[PDB]
Amino acid sequence: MRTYTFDQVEKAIEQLYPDFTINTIEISGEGNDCIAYEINRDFIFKFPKHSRGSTNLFNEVNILKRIHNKLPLPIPEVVFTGMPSETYQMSFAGFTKIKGVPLTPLLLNNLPKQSQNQAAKDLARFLSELHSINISGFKSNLVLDFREKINEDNKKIKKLLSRELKGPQMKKVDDFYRDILENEIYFKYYPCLIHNDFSSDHILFDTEKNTICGIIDFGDAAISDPDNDFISLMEDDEEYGMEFVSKILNHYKHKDIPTVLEKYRMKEKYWSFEKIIYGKEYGYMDWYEEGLNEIRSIKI
Numbered sequence: 202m203r204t205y206t207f208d209q210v211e212k213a214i215e216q217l218y219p220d221f222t223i224n225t226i227e228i229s230g231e232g233n234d235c236i237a238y239e240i241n242r243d244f245i246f247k248f249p250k251h252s253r254g255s256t257n258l259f260n261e262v263n264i265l266k267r268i269h270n271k272l273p274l275p276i277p278e279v280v281f282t283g284m285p286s287e288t289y290q291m292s293f294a295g296f297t298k299i300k301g302v303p304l305t306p307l308l309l310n311n312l313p314k315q316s317q318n319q320a321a322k323d324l325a326r327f328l329s330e331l332h333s334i335n336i337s338g339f340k341s342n343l344v345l346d347f348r349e350k351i352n353e354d355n356k357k358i359k360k361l362l363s364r365e366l367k368g369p370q371m372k373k374v375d376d377f378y379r380d381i382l383e384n385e386i387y388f389k390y391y392p393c394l395i396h397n398d399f400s401s402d403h404i405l406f407d408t409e410k411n412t413i414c415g416i417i418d419f420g421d422a423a424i425s426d427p428d429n430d431f432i433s434l435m436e437d438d439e440e441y442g443m444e445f446v447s448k449i450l451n452h453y454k455h456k457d458i459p460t461v462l463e464k465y466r467m468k469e470k471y472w473s474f475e476k477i478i479y480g481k482e483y484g485y486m487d488w489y490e491e492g493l494n495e496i497r498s499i500k501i
Contacts, residue, residue, distance in 0.1 A: 205248050210238055234420055246295040252288035259291040261420045274327050275299055275415045299415035301405030316411040323413045325452030332393045332427040345425040347388055357478050370496050390426040397421040399430040400440055432465040
């Protein structure tokens with residue numbers, strides 16, 4: 202893991218845009234991949250923290266460029282771009298900022314019912330248009346393989362938790378992996394471009410007009426299962442309700458919602474385990490302890 206100063210960031214952006222004048226620079230956020238810098242209150246510049254991050258940055262730029270004016274809600278335009286360097290394919294990129302505030306469950310449930318129903322409509326049309334884009338010109342490295350994902354994750358789990366779990370408890374996490382790989386519903390889907398991180402934090406809302414005014418954070422977008430963009434909208438209570446997400450599903454004219462829900466139940470359980478890895482990686486004791494408490498708990 203590396204990090205950047207404000208001076209490092211300004212220098213990089215000047216050499217490649219030596220005419221561009223940086224006036225105000227604050228940090229807007231940080232994810233697993235990238236530190237976001239807000240520049241001139243109008244642009245978000247993202248800088249990778251590692252190789253994989255720089256790869257995802259590159260993919261995010263190529264994806265956004267490619268759908269630039271294609272979708273029925275605003276999304277970041279790529280305005281500025283950096284260069285390859287050692288392991289880094291994209292040294293940085295800069296994007297338009299998007300006015301609005303996250304459509305949190307709280308905010309959502311406090312809107313009048315006609316505005317909530319309009320929100321379900323807008324999300325559906327967005328997802329539907331996104332999922333329609335033809336993929337036959339995307340490189341193969343952007344097609345996610347879920348069998349391989351599962352095998353990687355089962356392997357990392359077994360390493361982290363070797364000294365934390367008794368044999369019967371390890372067996373039961375392995376039972377989870379074993380069974381999902383043996384069930385074709387999770388691998389037998391029509392691949393399309395998906396946001397791959399489609400939740401409340403990344404849906405921007407205009408509180409004046411009481412409508413949705415943006416989607417952001419395409420850093421994990423890929424070619425994968427479109428149903429994944431519906432199941433991410435739900436997370437017990439921490440995200441939206443089934444009732445809300447159903448209106449999305451029906452506006453989008455999805456033809457097998459049971460399958461969506463089966464993927465939902467699976468993903469809930471899957472994140473029960475995956476959180477433990479992120480838990481150890483970032484030192485987040487909620488994710489690590491609660492995950493480990495669920496495994497040890499005999500309720501299941």
